[PDB]
Design a binder for this molecule. Structure first.
Ligand SMILES: Nc1nc2c(ncn2[C@@H]2O[C@@H]3COP(=O)(O)O[C@H]4[C@@H](O)[C@H](n5cnc6c(=O)[nH]c(N)nc65)O[C@@H]4COP(=O)(O)O[C@H]3[C@H]2O)c(=O)[nH]1
Ligand SMILES: Nc1nc2c(ncn2[C@@H]2O[C@@H]3COP(=O)(O)O[C@H]4[C@@H](O)[C@H](n5cnc6c(=O)[nH]c(N)nc65)O[C@@H]4COP(=O)(O)O[C@H]3[C@H]2O)c(=O)[nH]1
Ligand SMILES: [Ca+2]
Ligand SMILES: [Ca+2]
Ligand SMILES: [Ca+2]
Ligand SMILES: [Ca+2]
Lengths: 237, 237
């Protein structure tokens, strides 16, 4: 209730090997399903802290109410807070109140539109890992979310940007990028997740290339205040 | 026609395989060897184009005056000139007047906060290639200069950011990043160039890993209005 209100949509992440849902990404929405950008547009510098806290409690509260028993992935605001130990208490308290294990919460980090801070994000990531949270680098291969992040700290998961996934079955350059990045992730013991999968052709190439966790319209669109079920076409095909 | 004046320093790029000097990067300086940042700090949106053009002509003219016979590498300003012949003619004319071959000029592209027009950088790169210029992605593995660029267009050279090079002989994560990136560059028929090499230990790992083109204080610092000679410690053969 920081001048405005909002809620969450949820989008499944699928394990294409086991054909089970690994979890859901929480995606901020307006009360009448207005887009995430229109909500985040209302966030200013005096909002960052309070807005980020509301996102986590809303996602946890909604996911618990909806009966989510797999992972809950929450986007971490790009700049926002410096100190990592203080006001995470409200996240820990919410997780306790809704009986949602910390180990089932993943935070997605996409650096910023800022310079070579990186040591800023690193200590946040390593502190969250120390409490039991899962961590992901988001939008890998776009913007400031790249190899510079990976060089200084490693998350549990790397979500590869949809720009690199698009039409990968037909794009030899994207094929070479992904094959070498998958070997990199394997060397670093990082689990890849392909984001923005829109067609069976992308899915099949990515699955053959070794990706298991995937997300995208091909599986299910984000669901307003709900947990969407997943497309049956991928599990048989 | 600019409010201020400046000149260039030059820093050699070495080929550790052929043991020859590949070329020199031109680095903008003030008339009294003031730093590049102090010069570029005076550039605003009403300056970007003209400043970028002056840098090119000054680098070409000085390199010619100093008798440069290898490649000349020139930085392209983030969000500089427009898509087509936006007076690249003045660059062609200067190269001709100073009898500097077009194929010996390389332009370095370092993106910084471009998200919208994707073919914007691509069309400049493909047009310059069509004129005979060499092209490089600069600072690969930092800022907005990452895998997203490589996916949609490929330059002749990729300069890997010094952040990825630093202490690589002792850094297992940076070794894996570089090993897998070197294989990617080879798959894309792109020549790698390791930037910011500061010690023999970094040089030795990079050479054993297959890197040929290198740049850094280990070889020579930039020389104000001069072409520095290269470190005798490696050049003894
Ligand atoms: N073209 C395409 N898009 C797909 C596909 N599958 C999922 N998406 C969309 O792509 C975005 C993925 O989330 P994001 O990359 O982190 O990009 C997000 C995220 O960076 C930001 N953000 C969203 N929710 C939150 C939040 O709760 N807290 C914070 N701090 N930031 C958020 O807003 C961005 C947009 O989120 P959305 O509008 O929901 O758009 C979502 C999602 O709806 C696909 O197959 N094709
Ligand atoms: N720590 C370390 N640094 C090394 C080493 N070897 C070279 N360098 C420094 O790192 C910078 C390399 O150039 P840059 O990455 O493109 O980064 C440059 C470039 O982006 C920008 N710039 C410089 N000259 C020009 C120009 O003529 N035109 C445009 N548009 N930008 C320029 O200014 C940036 C800084 O230029 P400089 O002050 O000359 O700093 C140079 C260079 O002096 C090393 O071994 N260790
Ligand atoms: Ca995300
Ligand atoms: Ca994302
Ligand atoms: Ca450069
Ligand atoms: Ca550079």
């Amino acid at each position: 209730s920081l001048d405005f209100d909002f809620t969450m949509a949820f989008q499944p992440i699928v394990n294409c090997r086991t054909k089970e849902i690994f979890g859901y990404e929480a995606l901020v929405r307006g009360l009448n399903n207005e887009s995430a950008y229109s909500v985040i547009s209302r966030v200013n510098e005096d909002n960052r802290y309070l807005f980020d806290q509301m996102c986590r409690v809303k996602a946890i509260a909604l996911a618990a109410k909806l009966g989510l028993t797999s992972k809950l992935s929450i986007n971490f605001l790009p700049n926002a807070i410096y100190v990592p130990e203080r006001c995470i208490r409200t996240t820990l308290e919410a997780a306790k109140r809704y009986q949602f294990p910390i180990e089932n919460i993943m935070f997605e980090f996409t650096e910023a539109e800022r310079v070579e801070d990186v040591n800023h994000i690193k200590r946040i990531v390593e502190y969250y890992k120390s409490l039991g949270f899962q961590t992901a680098i988001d939008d890998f291969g776009s913007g400031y979310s790249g190899l510079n992040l990976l060089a200084d700290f490693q998350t549990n998961i790397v979500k590869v940007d949809m720009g690199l996934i698009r039409n990968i079955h037909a794009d030899q350059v994207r094929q070479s990028i992904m094959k070498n990045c998958l070997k990199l992730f394997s060397d670093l013991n990082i689990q890849p997740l392909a984001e923005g999968v829109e067609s069976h052709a992308e899915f099949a190439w990515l699955k053959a290339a070794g990706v298991e966790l995937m997300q995208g319209y091909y599986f299910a669109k984000p669901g307003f205040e709900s947990l969407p079920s997943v497309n049956p076409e991928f599990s048989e095909a």
